[PDB]
Amino acid sequence: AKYVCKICGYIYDEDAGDPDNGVSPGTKFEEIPDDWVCPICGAPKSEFEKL
């Protein structure tokens, strides 16, 4: 699945993950640590919406 950051437009793709910030490819959005934030704008997970 893909989620968009409502603040800046960054797309979190579960297939790509966010390796530079400790999230390997395949990690579901729900499993990402609660302290992880948008790598572009710093928005918390609450500001993402599932596409």
DSSP state of 42: -
Nearer to Fe ion, 27 or 48 (CB): 48
List the one residue from 7, 17, 18, 36 that touches Fe ion (CB under 5 A). 7
Q: Are 17 and 23 in contact (CB under 8 A)?
A: yes
**Alpha-carbon Rg for the chain in angstroms:** 10
Q: Is 10 in the site for Fe ion (CB under 5 A)?
A: yes
Q: Are 7 and 43 in contact (CB under 8 A)?
A: yes
Least Å from the CB of residue 7 to Fe ion: 5
Binding residues (CB under 5 A) for Fe ion: these are 5, 7-8, 10, 38, 40-41, 43
